[PDB]
Amino acid sequence: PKIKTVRGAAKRFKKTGKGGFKHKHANLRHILTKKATKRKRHLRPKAMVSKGDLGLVIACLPYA
Amino acid sequence: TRNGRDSEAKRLGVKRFGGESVLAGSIIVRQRGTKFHAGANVGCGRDHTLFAKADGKVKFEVKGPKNRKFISIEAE
Amino acid sequence: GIREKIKLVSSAGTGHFYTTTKNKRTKPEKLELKKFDPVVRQHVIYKEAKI
Amino acid sequence: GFEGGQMPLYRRLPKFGFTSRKAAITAEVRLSDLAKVEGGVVDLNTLKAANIIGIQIEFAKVILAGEVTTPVTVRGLRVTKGARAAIEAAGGKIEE
RNA sequence: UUUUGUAUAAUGGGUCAGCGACUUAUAUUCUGUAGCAAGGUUAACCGAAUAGGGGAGCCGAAGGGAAACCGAGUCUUAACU
RNA sequence: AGGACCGAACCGACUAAUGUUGAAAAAUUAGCGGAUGACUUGUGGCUGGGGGUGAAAGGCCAAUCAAACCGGGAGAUAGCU
RNA sequence: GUUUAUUAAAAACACAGCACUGUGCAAACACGAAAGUGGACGUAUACGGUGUGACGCCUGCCCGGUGCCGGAAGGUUAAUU
RNA sequence: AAUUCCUUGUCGGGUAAGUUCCGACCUGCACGAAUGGCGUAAUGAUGGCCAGGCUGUCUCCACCCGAGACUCAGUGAAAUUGAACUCGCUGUGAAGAUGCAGUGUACCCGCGGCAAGACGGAAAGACCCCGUGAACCUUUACUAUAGCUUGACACUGAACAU
RNA sequence: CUUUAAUGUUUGAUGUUCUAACGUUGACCCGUAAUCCGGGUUGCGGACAGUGUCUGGUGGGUAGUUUGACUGGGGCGGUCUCCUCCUAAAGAGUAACGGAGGAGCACGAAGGUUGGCUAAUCCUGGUCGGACAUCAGGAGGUUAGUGCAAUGGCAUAAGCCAGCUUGACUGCGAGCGUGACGGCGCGAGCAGGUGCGAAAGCAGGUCAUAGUGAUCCGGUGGUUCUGAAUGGAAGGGCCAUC
Ligand SMILES: [Mg+2]
Ligand SMILES: [Mg+2]
Ligand SMILES: [Mg+2]
Ligand SMILES: [Mg+2]
Ligand SMILES: [Mg+2]
Ligand SMILES: [Mg+2]
Ligand SMILES: [Mg+2]
Ligand SMILES: [Mg+2]
Ligand SMILES: [Mg+2]
Ligand SMILES: [Mg+2]
Ligand SMILES: [Mg+2]
Ligand SMILES: [Mg+2]
Ligand SMILES: [Mg+2]
Ligand SMILES: [Mg+2]
Ligand SMILES: [Mg+2]
Ligand SMILES: [Mg+2]
Ligand SMILES: [Mg+2]
Ligand SMILES: [Mg+2]
Ligand SMILES: [Mg+2]
Ligand SMILES: [Mg+2]
Ligand SMILES: [Mg+2]
Ligand SMILES: [Mg+2]
Ligand SMILES: [Mg+2]
Ligand SMILES: [Mg+2]
Ligand SMILES: [Mg+2]
Ligand SMILES: [Mg+2]
Ligand SMILES: [Mg+2]
Ligand SMILES: [Mg+2]
Ligand SMILES: [Mg+2]
Ligand SMILES: [Mg+2]
Ligand SMILES: [Mg+2]
Ligand SMILES: [Mg+2]
Ligand SMILES: [Mg+2]
Ligand SMILES: [Mg+2]
Ligand SMILES: [Mg+2]
Ligand SMILES: [Mg+2]
Ligand SMILES: [Mg+2]
Ligand SMILES: [Mg+2]
Ligand SMILES: [Mg+2]
Ligand SMILES: [Mg+2]
Ligand SMILES: [Mg+2]
Ligand SMILES: [Mg+2]
Ligand SMILES: [Mg+2]
Ligand SMILES: [Mg+2]
Ligand SMILES: [Mg+2]
Ligand SMILES: [Mg+2]
Ligand SMILES: [Mg+2]
Ligand SMILES: [Mg+2]
Ligand SMILES: [Mg+2]
Ligand SMILES: [Mg+2]
Ligand SMILES: [Mg+2]
Ligand SMILES: [Mg+2]
Ligand SMILES: [Mg+2]
Ligand SMILES: [Mg+2]
Ligand SMILES: [Mg+2]
Ligand SMILES: [Mg+2]
Ligand SMILES: [Mg+2]
Ligand SMILES: [Mg+2]
Ligand SMILES: [Mg+2]
Ligand SMILES: [Mg+2]
Ligand SMILES: [Mg+2]
Ligand SMILES: [Mg+2]
Ligand SMILES: [Mg+2]
Ligand SMILES: [Mg+2]
Ligand SMILES: [Mg+2]
Ligand SMILES: [Mg+2]
Ligand SMILES: [Mg+2]
Ligand SMILES: [Mg+2]
Ligand SMILES: [Mg+2]
Ligand SMILES: [Mg+2]
Ligand SMILES: [Mg+2]
Ligand SMILES: [Mg+2]
Ligand SMILES: [Mg+2]
Ligand SMILES: [Mg+2]
Ligand SMILES: [Mg+2]
Ligand SMILES: [Mg+2]
Ligand SMILES: [Mg+2]
Ligand SMILES: [Mg+2]
Ligand SMILES: [Mg+2]
Numbered sequence: 001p002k003i004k005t006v007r008g009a010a011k012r013f014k015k016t017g018k019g020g021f022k023h024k025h026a027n028l029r030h031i032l033t034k035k036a037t038k039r040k041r042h043l044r045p046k047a048m049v050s051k052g053d054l055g056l057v058i059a060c061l062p063y064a
Numbered sequence: 065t066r067n068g069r070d071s072e073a074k075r076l077g078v079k080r081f082g083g084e085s086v087l088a089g090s091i092i093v094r095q096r097g098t099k100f101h102a103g104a105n106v107g108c109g110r111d112h113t114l115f116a117k118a119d120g121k122v123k124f125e126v127k128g129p130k131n132r133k134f135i136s137i138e139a140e
Numbered sequence: 141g142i143r144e145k146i147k148l149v150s151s152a153g154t155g156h157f158y159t160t161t162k163n164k165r166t167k168p169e170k171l172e173l174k175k176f177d178p179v180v181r182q183h184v185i186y187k188e189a190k191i
Numbered sequence: 192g193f194e195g196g197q198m199p200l201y202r203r204l205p206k207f208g209f210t211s212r213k214a215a216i217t218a219e220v221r222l223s224d225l226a227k228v229e230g231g232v233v234d235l236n237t238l239k240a241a242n243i244i245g246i247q248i249e250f251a252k253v254i255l256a257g258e259v260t261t262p263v264t265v266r267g268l269r270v271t272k273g274a275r276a277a278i279e280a281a282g283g284k285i286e287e
Numbered sequence: 288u289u290u291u292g293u294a295u296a297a298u299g300g301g302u303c304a305g306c307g308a309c310u311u312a313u314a315u316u317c318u319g320u321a322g323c324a325a326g327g328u329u330a331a332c333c334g335a336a337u338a339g340g341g342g343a344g345c346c347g348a349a350g351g352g353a354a355a356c357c358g359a360g361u362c363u364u365a366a367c368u
Numbered sequence: 369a370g371g372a373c374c375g376a377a378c379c380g381a382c383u384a385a386u387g388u389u390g391a392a393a394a395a396u397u398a399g400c401g402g403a404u405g406a407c408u409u410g411u412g413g414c415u416g417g418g419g420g421u422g423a424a425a426g427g428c429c430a431a432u433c434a435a436a437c438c439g440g441g442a443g444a445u446a447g448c449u
Numbered sequence: 450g451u452u453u454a455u456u457a458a459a460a461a462c463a464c465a466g467c468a469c470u471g472u473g474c475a476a477a478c479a480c481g482a483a484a485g486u487g488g489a490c491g492u493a494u495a496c497g498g499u500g501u502g503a504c505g506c507c508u509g510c511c512c513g514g515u516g517c518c519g520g521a522a523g524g525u526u527a528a529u530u
Numbered sequence: 531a532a533u534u535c536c537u538u539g540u541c542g543g544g545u546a547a548g549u550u551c552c553g554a555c556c557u558g559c560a561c562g563a564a565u566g567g568c569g570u571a572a573u574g575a576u577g578g579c580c581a582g583g584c585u586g587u588c589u590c591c592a593c594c595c596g597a598g599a600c601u602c603a604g605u606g607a608a609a610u611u612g613a614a615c616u617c618g619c620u621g622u623g624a625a626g627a628u629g630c631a632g633u634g635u636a637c638c639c640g641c642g643g644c645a646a647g648a649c650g651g652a653a654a655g656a657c658c659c660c661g662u663g664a665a666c667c668u669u670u671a672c673u674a675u676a677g678c679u680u681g682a683c684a685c686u687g688a689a690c691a692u
Numbered sequence: 693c694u695u696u697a698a699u700g701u702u703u704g705a706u707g708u709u710c711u712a713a714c715g716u717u718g719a720c721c722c723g724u725a726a727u728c729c730g731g732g733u734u735g736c737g738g739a740c741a742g743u744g745u746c747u748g749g750u751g752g753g754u755a756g757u758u759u760g761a762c763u764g765g766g767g768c769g770g771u772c773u774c775c776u777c778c779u780a781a782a783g784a785g786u787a788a789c790g791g792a793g794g795a796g797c798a799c800g801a802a803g804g805u806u807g808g809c810u811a812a813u814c815c816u817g818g819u820c821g822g823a824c825a826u827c828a829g830g831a832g833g834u835u836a837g838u839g840c841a842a843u844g845g846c847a848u849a850a851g852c853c854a855g856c857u858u859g860a861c862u863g864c865g866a867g868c869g870u871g872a873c874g875g876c877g878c879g880a881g882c883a884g885g886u887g888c889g890a891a892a893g894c895a896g897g898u899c900a901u902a903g904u905g906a907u908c909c910g911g912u913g914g915u916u917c918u919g920a921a922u923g924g925a926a927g928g929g930c931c932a933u934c
Contacts, residue, residue, distance in 0.1 A: 002314050006192060008908095009201035014208075017350055024207040024353095026874060026906060032933060033145055033159040034904090038896070039876090041864080044931090045363070046207075046353095052872050053200050060192045060201055062315055067791060071775045074901070075784060075870060076844095089867025089879065096900055097845025111900055112845080113878050115868075141797060141903095147913095147933080155914050159933065160860075163799080171800065176885060178862040179914095181365065183886055191912090191934065194873095203874055203906050208353040209929045211918070219349075219358085223325085242342075254358055256349065257325095271358055 009060035013049065021049040021057055021064075082124050086116045092135055100124075103136035146171070148186040154179035158186065218248045220268065222277055223257025233265045259283065 013021040025043045032040065049057055058064070076094045080086050092114045093100050102108040103125070105118040116122070120137040127134055143161040148171065150156045156179050162171065171188040192199050220243065225233055228241040235251060238244045244251060253265065255273035263283040270278065270285055278285060 001312095006201065008206075009192065011206045011208075012201055012204045012907095014353095024205045026204055027876095029205060029907080030934065031905075033161065036860095036896090037862080041862090049200075050873065053874090056192055056194075056200055056873095058316085065770060065789070067793090068771070068789070069775095069793085070777090071902080073785065076901095077783060079869065081783085087867055088881095091868050091878065094869075094878085095845090096843070097850090098899095099844070107880065109878050110898095111878070113869085115879060117880060119867095143798080145934085155932090157913080157932075158860090160800090167800080169800095173800070173858055173860090174886085175858075176861045178365090178884090181862080181884065183858090183861080198874085198906065200874070202908085205907065207929085209918070211354060212920070213355080213918080221348075223348085245344090252358085254349075256359085269357095273359075 003062045005063055006060035009057070010064070013057060013061060013064070015061075015064045016048070021054070021061075022046045023049060080116075080122045082122055084122050086120065086122055086137070088116055088119050090116045092116060092122055100133050100135050103134035105137035105139065106135055145191045146188050147191050148173065148175065149189045150175075150177045150179070151185040151187065152177045152180045152182070157189075159191070162188070216247060216249045218244045218251045220244070220251055220253045221256035222253070222259045222274060225253070225259045225263045225265075225278075225283075226261055231261070231263055233263055233268065235267055253278070 013023055015021055023046065025045075025047055027035075028040060028043045074094075076096070078093050080090060080092045086092070092106065094111075094113050096112065098108070098112050100114060102114050103123075105116065105120065107115050107117050109115065114135055116137050118137055118139055120139040123136045123138050125134050125136065126132070142165070143163050145159060146162050147157045147159050154177055156177050158175055160171075173186055174183055175186045176183050192201055194200075220233075220238065224238075224243050227243060228237045230237055233253075235244070235248070238251060239246055239248070250269075252269040252271065253274045254271050255277055259278055259281045261283075262281055263278060264286060265278065265283070266286045275285060
């Protein structure tokens with residue numbers, strides 16, 4: 001049978017032009033008053049999945 | 065029984081030693097207070113982190129009436 | 141513990157707000173600092189409202 | 192994706208975005224595709240009848256990729272600034 | 288066989304003969320090899336036809352952005368050195 | 369007269385020895401309790417498994433019982449040997 | 450008298466007797482998706498449930514807690530509207 | 531004390547001598563009134579203790595009568611078993627050795643006996659811990675649920691009075 | 693606008709009475725050789741009882757399951773995240789149910805800047821006034837101080853006092869530190885707009901190192917995004933926040 005994609009994982013990653021993945025940063029959903037603007041500002045643009053993880057991510061998204 | 069606690073180590077200390085070639089930005093020392101004082105072309109952060117303000121080479125020296133230790137960037 | 145959370149609101153009608161904390165027992169005085177609203181791109185009055 | 196009990200990566204990260212139903216029925220077209228059609232006109236329909244775009248595409252744009260070297264007229268497509276000048280350099284016109 | 292470590296007084300086998308354990312299907316990625324190459328390849332089905340037909344489709348030649356959208360650029364911001 | 373008394377058949381099972389790959393998957397030998405009664409026994413019938421039946425021991429329900437047996441889900445699952 | 454058929458026969462279970470409580474008869478209660486049936490071809494001197502256990506002398510104080518029985522002024526409270 | 535931890539409590543009796551027994555005391559670790567209290571004739575293959583009688587139970591065993599054991603003839607099992615040319619001692623070593631080191635002893639092979647060892651045979655320890663194993667049991671653990679119960683609408687109507 | 697009264701009248705609430713639904717495990721008749729059932733006659737009950745649907749209570753009667761880990765065996769006790777010192781062997785890091793202590797905040801000033809200022813403690817003299825209050829002098833030299841532990845800092849003070857103020861700004865960020873990762877930390881300089889200072893300059897919270905919680909699912913405000921025939925809308929995205 002066709003492999004099934006891990007559906008939660010496909011809502012947290014998009015693949016890029018050289019076959020990396022971009023995700024939103026953690027820590028920016030609630031409890032914000034006590035966080036500094038600097039910290040929050042840097043946490044706002046999307047990031048690239050690191051090399052340790054990138055095996056775990058491809059397993060989950062075979063049709064990405 | 066009343067003991068058994070400790071905190072996580074902060075990796076403080078010298079990151080760049082005398083003569084090393086650094087780029088503007090690079091951290092030189094991490095410290096608590098000014099065990100070292102910023103000299104020429106060196107800034108001091110809000111946790112007393114000393115960093116190079118200009119590309120060049122790290123230089124330590126003792127100077128002043130208190131015999132304090134200073135860190136400077138020779139712009140070699 | 142005791143310090144509540146509040147929002148300071150632009151006077152420039154933009155909507156934009158900052159957030160901060162306040163001891164209401166000791167200092168119950170609607171706090172009015174002056175901050176930079178970036179929707180009109182000028183410093184204006186901000187006035188304590190409720191979170 | 193199981194890591195032994197540690198909250199896995201695809202769960203300690205937040206979800207983001209929404210999918211567009213428009214993007215599905217949209218297409219791009221290369222300059223190397225303009226000769227491929229029969230007729231020297233490029234409409235949405237000629238593209239579909241030359242099997243350049245699928246039968247359910249409603250909007251198409253021409254981008255600067257490859258090269259046109261034959262006069263063509265292009266009706267109803269959007270065209271990028273760069274691709275526009277390429278089509279014109281051949282001696283082709285861009286109606287709507 | 289299991290272990291840091293077994294002549295071990297730790298495990299298993301009285302002996303012989305026969306049988307007894309990494310397979311199959313379908314997807315996906317990488318390596319080798321073959322064909323064709325900015326293209327490659329068809330599925331069901333038609334066909335007596337391992338031929339021939341069938342290009343529905345799939346993959347690739349363009350990306351960026353949550354998205355509208357723009358496009359060799361794009362997003363970010365009022366604007367980027 | 370009697371859930372009276374002594375005591376065979378009949379119904380039991382307190383002690384000891386033997387036996388423990390037995391003569392026997394619970395017996396034999398010597399003694400032991402009841403023996404007109406809530407007694408004992410033949411033939412047939414009824415109660416069916418989270419159910420029965422139990423002067424109650426979780427006892428018994430075909431040498432199987434804190435949930436019978438037989439077939440099916442079934443190649444349950446086994447981070448263990 | 451009864452009991453762990455097969456390591457326990459007993460001080461355990463049962464028992465006559467005693468008390469509390471339920472039950473007015475299409476009884477309570479029990480087996481039944483139901484129809485029905487047991488209770489009982491009985492009717493409160495009867496029937497079910499619970500504890501205690503011949504007989505003798507007796508069975509003290511506590512209703513705050515938990516259950517049950519009675520109350521219904523007020524507080525809180527469902528579907529519905 | 532079928533209850534007493536301390537405890538073989540203390541005093542009395544029984545015995546040459548009695549952690550048990552019988553009678554008392556009260557300091558009841560931690561009795562007590564129908565999950566009954568205290569008594570009680572009779573009854574008991576019921577628990578504890580003491581006497582007479584009787585005895586191989588014992589001092590301390592002896593002899594005898596039978597059935598095996600032993601020999602001959604016939605028939606003919608079993609558990610177990612990596613392979614064996616299968617001794618002692620003192621050391622050593624997966625730390626308790628027929629098998630290693632040193633040494634001592636020992637001609638080859640049966641039969642009747644005995645059980646010190648082969649960590650002897652039998653049952654993948656029942657104790658103990660572990661597994662995000664199991665079952666069944668309890669409850670004011672959680673979630674449900676049959677049963678019992680409340681109300682609303684339906685089957686379900688009429689007349690009067692307030 | 694009627695404070696409010698009567699009559700009709702749509703309707704509820706309460707009881708009385710009635711019979712025709714419905715009950716009858718009362719009597720009698722027939723099917724009928726029948727203590728079943730049905731039909732019939734009569735009596736008694738009667739919109740009650742009872743049953744369906746919906747609903748609150750109760751419910752170990754029955755069912756499915758949960759009931760942590762570390763641990764000189766397990767259990768009991770203690771512990772589980774974060775900060776500081778030591779152990780730690782003069783770079784970083786480094787274990788034990790090793791030795792000692794803290795945190796789960798507080799501050800619109802206790803933040804920014806400008807101007808100014810220097811501690812503890814003892815002695816001598818001095819109304820109440822005492823070992824210790826406030827005053828004057830001397831010695832002293834940080835033995836003080838730091839909103840709260842410990843360590844490292846601190847006089848150009850980071851310690852103490854005043855005036856004016858909101859940089860406890862918004863967008864970004866060369867480069868570097870620390871982590872397996874998620875992440876966390878430091879940062880010169882650009883752009884916009886501020887405060888203090890004559891100015892040079894300084895300021896993106898606080899002497900520094902604790903004061904903390906991923907994701908999901910929801911809430912609130914904003915929004916040149918999306919909007920299942922089309923215009924809207926609902927919902928979704930994005931930015932701020934709970
Ligand atoms: Mg958000
Ligand atoms: Mg430390
Ligand atoms: Mg700074
Ligand atoms: Mg966990
Ligand atoms: Mg096509
Ligand atoms: Mg071992
Ligand atoms: Mg060896
Ligand atoms: Mg050994
Ligand atoms: Mg051996
Ligand atoms: Mg063993
Ligand atoms: Mg072995
Ligand atoms: Mg083996
Ligand atoms: Mg073996
Ligand atoms: Mg090839
Ligand atoms: Mg008799
Ligand atoms: Mg007798
Ligand atoms: Mg007799
Ligand atoms: Mg007899
Ligand atoms: Mg006799
Ligand atoms: Mg007798
Ligand atoms: Mg029979
Ligand atoms: Mg069954
Ligand atoms: Mg039991
Ligand atoms: Mg049996
Ligand atoms: Mg079961
Ligand atoms: Mg199955
Ligand atoms: Mg199996
Ligand atoms: Mg008897
Ligand atoms: Mg019997
Ligand atoms: Mg027995
Ligand atoms: Mg017996
Ligand atoms: Mg009992
Ligand atoms: Mg009935
Ligand atoms: Mg009793
Ligand atoms: Mg009361
Ligand atoms: Mg009373
Ligand atoms: Mg009540
Ligand atoms: Mg004793
Ligand atoms: Mg005496
Ligand atoms: Mg005595
Ligand atoms: Mg006594
Ligand atoms: Mg008692
Ligand atoms: Mg008691
Ligand atoms: Mg009483
Ligand atoms: Mg009582
Ligand atoms: Mg009694
Ligand atoms: Mg007594
Ligand atoms: Mg007697
Ligand atoms: Mg007896
Ligand atoms: Mg006796
Ligand atoms: Mg005697
Ligand atoms: Mg023979
Ligand atoms: Mg040894
Ligand atoms: Mg030895
Ligand atoms: Mg030797
Ligand atoms: Mg021999
Ligand atoms: Mg023997
Ligand atoms: Mg053995
Ligand atoms: Mg085992
Ligand atoms: Mg249960
Ligand atoms: Mg299950
Ligand atoms: Mg379980
Ligand atoms: Mg444990
Ligand atoms: Mg070190
Ligand atoms: Mg070192
Ligand atoms: Mg280690
Ligand atoms: Mg440690
Ligand atoms: Mg301060
Ligand atoms: Mg100053
Ligand atoms: Mg004085
Ligand atoms: Mg002075
Ligand atoms: Mg000091
Ligand atoms: Mg300051
Ligand atoms: Mg960079
Ligand atoms: Mg000025
Ligand atoms: Mg501080
Ligand atoms: Mg949910
Ligand atoms: Mg629109
Ligand atoms: Mg629409």
